[PDB]
Structures are given as structure tokens and as C-alpha cells.
Ligand binder design. Structure first.
Ligand SMILES: [K+]
Length: 193
């Protein structure tokens, strides 16, 4: 097994976030089982890290940095860090004008079911209630491939998004605002076909 990468972590919490909001990311395991893994956090607060198994070979991991600054996120497979562990995340003070919980995202292209290969998967993002922030999307299929999402701002605080899935496998989409995961996200989408 010197040719295959057993474990992948990706998402906003690996890079960034905001005091008082949760820092979230996703971990996919192929080789060993999902509860085989450890996590620890090094930083200016004793953020409590928490793994949440989705049953499909992946989990939603999230922690709560109650202090601004630089945290080291460790993702461990048999007492060793995985490829890019640790992860340095810079947590920001909470801006008084950013509201990630208010972002709402929806569309056939974010639904668990119904999406089919080689056809456009579409959705919208409505940040009109969400105050000042940066939109950032992270997206991978289960084979670990990046998914390129077209995102066009309508201008009014609303976004048309689309991708064309290429294989009948899981595609996971994470949406963040102000560097913080939005409610309902990550979206696990079976591209059937
Ligand atoms: K790293």
C-alpha cells in the first residue's frame, strides 16, 4: 500500500474561521475505518474537536476556537499525521457584520438524490441576510478529485452555481461565508446515473 493515500481531510476549518462560530471540515477514509482516526488541536484555546460519522466512509469534523489566532489541526492515522497534517488555520475575531448562519443554499445540485452524470447540476446561494463576507466553495468527489463549480454573482446577493459531475459517485460540496461553514453544508450528493 505504498501507492495509495488512505485518508483525506479538506474544508474551511483546515484553513480559517471565526471566534464563536464552528470551524468545519470533512475527512474521507478509504483504507482504514473512520473511527480509526484521531484529532488534536494546538492553539490559543482548548477548542474541543468533534468527529461525526456519516456512515459512508466519511465524517463531518468540527471544532470551536474561542480565541483568535493560529491553530494546528492534526489528523492522525495509526499515530502518524496524514499527508498534509498538520494544517495551520488562522481563526479571526468575529466581525460584527458577518452572519454565516443566515446564508441559505439550495437547488437540485445540492440534493442527496437526482443528479446525473454529464448533465448540469445547478444551485443557488442566497446571502442577502448574511452581511459582509467572502464566498468560498470547497468541493471534491469520493475519488478525491476537485470539482470545479461555476459561481456567478447575480449582483443582488444571490449566486448561480453549477457543475457537471463526471462519474456516478458521491460529490461533496462545502460552502463558506466569511470563512465559516454554512448551515446544511457540507452537501453530500449522489450523482447517480
Ligand atoms: K498543511
Amino acid at each position: 500500500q505504498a501507492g495509495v493515500q488512505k485518508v483525506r481531510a479538506w474544508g474551511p476549518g483546515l484553513e480559517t474561521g471565526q471566534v464563536g462560530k464552528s470551524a468545519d471540515f470533512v475527512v474521507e477514509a478509504i483504507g482504514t475505518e473512520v473511527g480509526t482516526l484521531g484529532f488534536s488541536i494546538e492553539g490559543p484555546s482548548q477548542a474541543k474537536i468533534e468527529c461525526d460519522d456519516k456512515g459512508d466512509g466519511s465524517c463531518d469534523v468540527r471544532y470551536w476556537p474561542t480565541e483568535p489566532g493560529e491553530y494546528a489541526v492534526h489528523v492522525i492515522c495509526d499515530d502518524e499525521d496524514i499527508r498534509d497534517s498538520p494544517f495551520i488555520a488562522h481563526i479571526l475575531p468575529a466581525p460584527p457584520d458577518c452572519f454565516p448562519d443566515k446564508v441559505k443554499a439550495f437547488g437540485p445540485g445540492l440534493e442527496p438524490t437526482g443528479c446525473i452524470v454529464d448533465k448540469p447540476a445547478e444551485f443557488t446561494i442566497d446571502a442577502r441576510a448574511a452581511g459582509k463576507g467572502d464566498l468560498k466553495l470547497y468541493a471534491q468527489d469520493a475519488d478525491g478529485c476537485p470539482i470545479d463549480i461555476k459561481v456567478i454573482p447575480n449582483g443582488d446577493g444571490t449566486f448561480r452555481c453549477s457543475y457537471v459531475p463526471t462519474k456516478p459517485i458521491k460529490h461533496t460540496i462545502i460552502i463558506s461565508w466569511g470563512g465559516v461553514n454554512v448551515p446544511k453544508s457540507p452537501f453530500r450528493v449522489n450523482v447517480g446515473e
